[model samples]
Target: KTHVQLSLPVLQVRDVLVRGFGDSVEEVLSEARQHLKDGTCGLVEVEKGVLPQLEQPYVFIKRSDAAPHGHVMVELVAELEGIQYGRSGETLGVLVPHVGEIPVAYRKVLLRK
Candidate 1:
């Protein structure tokens, strides 16, 4: 089995609003409220180690009005069977308003019998 490890930073969803997407404060807050009212808001929990096949990462926003306390958010960097997945390099590299840019790294390994 291939061993893999990742360093994940925990954050609050409201913190994401106040920092990452601060540029469009009003619009984001509006959508967040709508999502909560529709019961589509929940928290995202990432499981460590090799993930199961066909499993995709998703966001889970917790139920709340404007600011929800006690809920944490973590961005998941995932790979499957040695292949990288998710958004394009350019999009991933774009800097957030105050959160800074997301970094991407790569590694190659040769499997031997």
Candidate 2:
């Protein structure tokens, strides 16, 4: 006999934004703010780790100003907390520094055949 196990992590989407490439920064921000409501909640998995570390989830929009550029930039950021394991699980992490701006970096990926 063979056994298979599946694990799913709580995935929540919040703060989504989409803006034009040549649009005014302030304008884009305004639109994003207008739609700045909590997003749908879902679940995902901790990739290749006993415990998964999650980054701040948020919505950001910016022009590439670099190669493989796109006309518009859209971003969404949210927080992930209260992780569960089974019937009885401990909180993996807690939400600290809840109200403060955090810095982030974006990278591009390429695939070759």
> Candidate 2, which segments miss by more than 4 Å at Cα?
1-22, 38-113
Candidate 2 achieves a global lDDT of 0.24
> Residue 6 of model 2: what lDDT?
14
Please give, for residues 1-113, the per-residue lDDT of candidate 2 as tens digits: 12111111233212112112113334433333342222111122223431233332312322222222311222322222442211212222211111222213212311010
Residue pairs with clashing backbones, model 1? 41-61, 42-60, 42-61, 42-62, 43-60
Candidate 2 to truth, TM? 0.18
Backbone clash count for every predicted candidate, in the order shown: 5, 11
Q: Specify the poorest-scoring 10-residue window by lDDT in model 1.
A: 88-97
